[model samples]
Target: SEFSQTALFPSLPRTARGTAVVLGNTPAGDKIQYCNGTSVYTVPVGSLTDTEIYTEHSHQTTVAKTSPSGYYCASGDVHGNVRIWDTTQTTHILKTTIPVFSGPVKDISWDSESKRIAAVGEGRERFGHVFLFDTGTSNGNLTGQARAMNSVDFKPSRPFRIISGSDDNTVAIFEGPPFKFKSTFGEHTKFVHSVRYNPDGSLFASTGGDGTIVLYNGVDGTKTGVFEDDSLKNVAHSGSVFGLTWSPDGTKIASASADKTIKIWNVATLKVEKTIPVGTRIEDQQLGIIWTKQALVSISANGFINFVNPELGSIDQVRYGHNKAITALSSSADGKTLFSADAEGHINSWDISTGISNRVFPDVHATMITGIKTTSKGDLFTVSWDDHLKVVPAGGSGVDSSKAVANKLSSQPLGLAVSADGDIAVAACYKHIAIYSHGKLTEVPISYNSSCVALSNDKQFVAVGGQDSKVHVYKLSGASVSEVKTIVHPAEITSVAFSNNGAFLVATDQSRKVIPYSVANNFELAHTNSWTFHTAKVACVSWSPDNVRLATGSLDNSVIVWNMNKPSDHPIIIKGAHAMSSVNSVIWLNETTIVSAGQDSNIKFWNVPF
Candidate 1:
């Protein structure tokens, strides 16, 4: 009489490129947070399947950070706002709009008292600001940095020392009650990306573009010592460092970098103790690092939040999903009804006309759904880790169990694109690309194994990124597949996106680098090393219908919007978009509205230029 009820909770099939991003960990780390489509969930640390979600955020959440007391949390979104909630009941206590920045808030920190909070990222007047969580009053004056602040933290205890890092290669310290600039330390030669204070409040650390770790006295802001020397020089990271976090004891620090590594250091010994190599794809670069008393967590560019041991020598458990990675995305020809799939196979549909998320389909597949396609005949298709290709019939119920049409396959499917002619459905599988038409399948051969793939609207070309560190383009038609061109890149590719008009193609690598190319000539157009916004792997990229803007998601659990016209400016960053999970997929439903999905099993919608 005791059936598993497993059928009612059937395992969502996994796609070739599918992954999961888990969230909502209890402050004690005994339980992790879980978001499933329309609800927020809590899962026991060791048992992922036992999950719970709180359906109260109204709009899907972008980020969630547990407070120092382990009783409450704060989350934010693309709408230029943040929400504070109590962990026990998952009830929101405060909601505030932060229009100081034209973009989203990237990160937030709690003071030892848990009354004052600091939120940072791409803003208009300044990069970040400090505010009171209880009354929504301005907490203090923020000064010293000439650029937008990238990260913000309140020293754990009172006389609260506030620390900020910026793109200007500077670290600014503030003394607070009414936080004001106390000192501006600019020893790093490049942009400073991450800054954090030790839990003990004795010291702080900064990591940046120069790949250096600069320690400072938490109270005085005085330089303590370098974590590296000539013999140990360049031992921190090979690329820009995105995030840093101190252990509970403050004797160790962990950092994530675009170099595809998570490194643990012995702060006392000033030596590197361990390194975790995640993957070779540029989108797999490590970006955010956090060490709780019980666990060490690192987020990758591709949306993997890896839980590691305190020693950082090896991984304990890895939870994948879109804290920032865009696992899958789909848009209409007219730029409406955009859908995005995350590493966990949750699909979110958006209505661009109203700037709202219309519906969410969670657990459509067992794992991540990397691709979404709309056939000319009005059928929707999804590719997931269940090792099967599924078709979602249009004009049907929105629940996962209701609309899926699956066909088992021999290999997993990664990327997906529908032809303008409507005669073909193209998908990238393990090492090869496959074509489907009228419910039949055919395979295409390629030289290198691929990590990502994309097909242009005209169906004239197919782009594949593989272990070769380049994008190989091929001619595609209903009847045939042929090689067209190859775009060389700086690192191994992870994900790729093509513009609506077929004018541009954006590729992201394991190093968290974004490379833009001209579709007409296949020439590299813009390569701003300062596409420097994401702290982790660049999961997915989407261009607005008019080709005026681009949105990117990363393992940092954040979403960033870039003005295609102004790539050098600070992007509008939205923090805590997916809690601990990565945002795996993003798509623009229209020129002004977008939708994103993450490993948290939630789908979110955003109105652009917000």
Candidate 2:
């Protein structure tokens, strides 16, 4: 029961069309924070590989900010609740919970002292609130905006000032411990998406859907000037600007926009210094930006975080992963790359050696990817709810849509598996099992509705799970198939897997049971007692290379590893493995390494000692 976490591929920021995303940084600027589902992810700026997730909120979270002192963090959710917790410790103990707004809390800002907070978003009576961070007592009222505010920021120096941007297309400046609105400026023609104050507190900047970035004096709220590209003669961005951040020295500012580009501006001259065009794809639209001494980072509409360097004049590194529930997991022929597909139909190819990931066939599937499998010849096969089966050629990245061969499926595919020799692939569909060999398709009629399918390593057998709580075994001979046996379960069968040695078969059910059968002994029960330690429906199962250990992931938010040699012994359990999300899939990387994917949009690697 001894295991250790070896690596983690953090989830990307959840993004939406026509919406701006907010990203926060620690006081030291080493980590960036953002919300994904109900969890707040704090990822390191250097590697982008390690991440710490905070799951204290019950509802969907919209914003999260680390206090200026770096001792605490406050996160706000769509249910209008704000939770303040200690960030200095791994536990992130909650300090207070305040029901602030009536709707979603869009943004949060802490004053220089880290004692007062300004929270703004949609609400019934009031759109924003200013309160004491520790006690949640009213410190002031934000009363200028006629509509919901989108962003808020506090000055860092003495004579502290607060600025808020709103959908009303106005920016308001406030002053006080009992904060009172001083004045509002309607200089923007459209919604103001972001307002940020420089680290030195000398200047504040605001960007909006109007495609402009305006600067103002921090203390008096007087308009300083507008940032315009002299060469372009007018706007700083051709498209709507969503976010802005100033360097620690206040000499440079970076603005993210829907233009699929980030512009670095020199504050002294108020001119564009560097223009980093991310990509031409619509998903490359820039939604958020952050400037740290160590790196300049921006979030793309596709959930990729790109590190931009002025010296390189291009993206230095890009962090890519799923922002939706992962639905399938597979490995390359050589086992040098791991492939993962999500509910959004996005697939990522991860290099095992360097931990780098690349999006594969970004525009292939239009809906949920049900299953993915690779062949010994380096070909990759995928089945999706979009009613299509696609193949990526050997040594190809699947980037060009024209190069992929897609076969129209008779019905939506539920599961897919490839044979060991790499010539045959079997897909489980709604009413039939579709077998593919050398670009030809054949169907085998089934009595029960199929939910999942698995092929034995020897290519002699196939196991198909049905919604009727049974797994029908089929003998595979060339292009023909025949029903062999039916293993009944107490509840609907969810998943099925055959060991690499072709000696044992494993299946999981909604009854939270894991049953193993011996194929060599006429499908006889391998164990007398069903493995029933799971508290919820078992979602997936994977057998180690040795064929003696099994790993199961469940809706109970746990991953359990069982030793077949000692069925009575307590299994190794990692509870709440994905926090509040269900473990969707599990795969064995080797005899000692296990990989798991979950609804949390994360892929984790574990090293077992036994």
Candidate 3:
């Protein structure tokens, strides 16, 4: 109860090449939910960074759909398990888990009553199923379909019906509660990707790889119309339309295409109304679209979500985030900005209060970025597993994405730390400690394998954590580093950091033990077994600006706060900060505001109760 969250910057929806992305939202359309990895995420339509995670799924989740009443959500996973959970509850309490088919679920749907559910995908025995929402009992059989179903939808009004788009290049309809295949339409010559019901259920729309948008009667299975012309000016889309959505008013149909554009069609005119291009590159292919209550949103293949103001028919804001696991996080020396690096060799600079993020040198690394730091003079330093160190010259808004100075490393760098003054930066490489003195590089040869490194603000000390389960402290004399002492630990040392004031040194190891040495006391132990509250191996640790507290993150999914005022007192433990994922990195935006990021690629800000 003492822990409070300020914000959560989450990963973008998972994207697959040439695959359609299905998006879901609350009944009120205030928030959107999508599946990524094993968890389903909920985000406000207006503010994307404020997020909540539903992490009950044990397998790779594909699609999540909210009920018509918005109280519950059904998420389908690769294992064919559909979890119905209460969205109103903070924990997202589970109601039931039903197995729909023998393979992955591509899409899910709920009737207007919110009592019945339909799931479709490539199944071993059947391609789809319709069932009661509260029970595992089947409502109907999906027959007369020869291939994998890619999408599914249920009519919202009277004369209940079900529709599906399939890889067999067909659209099928089912009638009644015990849905029976009634009719089929094969107007499209290629695979269909999505089928969606219009707002009032009077009409429906379908998109296919043939660059066509076909409309049908919601009451019957008859094909109504198809929007396709011979050339570009009248064509609905030039490439495969991967996503389709109906405007709530039922007047327009929004379609996302592999041609890198979002085109809308007026249902009455049955012609193109407007189109907004995403980008000029292949990665800019639009994969999904959703007409929420507040805005029209779309997802691109590069993991970015965009806002479309349909009234103006213009592209507005864009929401950007990491698409892979976050490895490390650090703040700028000025304390106003936070830097987060992910496994995909990407970094985002975030504002501490507003939570606005912009990518830094988006094309710099080809692999995972292991460490990040912003020096006092405004140079952002990032080291990666790609065996390179890149430096960004910073500005007030952000760093120049086009201008990052990159240097090749002698070996793969695991972690890096900047001096408290931000002058001397040290990187723990595979063989030795690589020190970056502004623009020059120096290697401090040592015996043990390096894991993590830290530099003191006074420029007098350098501490390196080694896989040999020892932390070797060295003296920094001008430009040379000399080994002075080696502190032994029970397990491998994972992280090491100097206190902001350069008065102490803290090191966390694989044994869940964190030890701090007093610099003024000639490197004597400050506390013995006092900072071991974490149940799992500590992944990373950071000292507060005031030096009176410390924040430590662990694989146990917790961040514990340590107090120097009461060294033996129980620390404030924030548990499940990123549920189901390891808290790989934690930092202090201030003395009270703690920021943590993990395997979920979410950067969360929590305020300590103390």
Per candidate, the number of residue pairs that clash is 72, 0, 0
After superposing candidate 2, which stretches have Cα over 4 Å from the reference?
395-402
TM-score of each: 0.52, 0.98, 0.97
- In angstroms, the error of model 3 at 391 is 0.8
Residue-level lDDT tens digits of model 3 in 361-468: 446577888888877777778898889888777553467546767888888898897765567878888887888886788876667788998888777888989999
Can you write out model 1's per-residue Cα lDDT over 67-106, one digit (the tens) per residue?
A: 7677666665434455666666534454444443555555
1-610: candidate 2 lDDT, tens digit per residue: 4887788888999899768888878888889998898999988886645788899799998899999899989999998898999998888888889999789999999999989999999988789999988999999889889998999999888797889999999999998868999999988999999999998898999988988999999998899899978766478898999899998789989999999999989898988888899999898899988887677889999899998886656898898888999998987667788888999888888987667888875456878999988777666788998888888774444334437789887877998988866689999999889999987888777777899999998898999999999999999987788889999999999999998998899999999999999999989888887599999999999899998998999999988999888888888998887889899999988888888899989888888868
- Candidate with top TM-score is 2
Give the worst 10-residue stretch by lDDT in candidate 3: 227-236
How much is 485 displaced in model 2, in angstroms?
Answer: 1.0
Error of 1 at 418 (Å): 20
In model 2, pairs of residues that clash are none
Q: Which stretches of candidate 3 lie over 4 Å from their true place?
A: 229-235, 395-397
Q: How are the candidates ranked when ordered by lDDT, highest leading? A: 2, 3, 1
RMSD in order of candidates: 18.2, 1.4, 1.7
Higher-ranked by lDDT: 1 or 3: 3
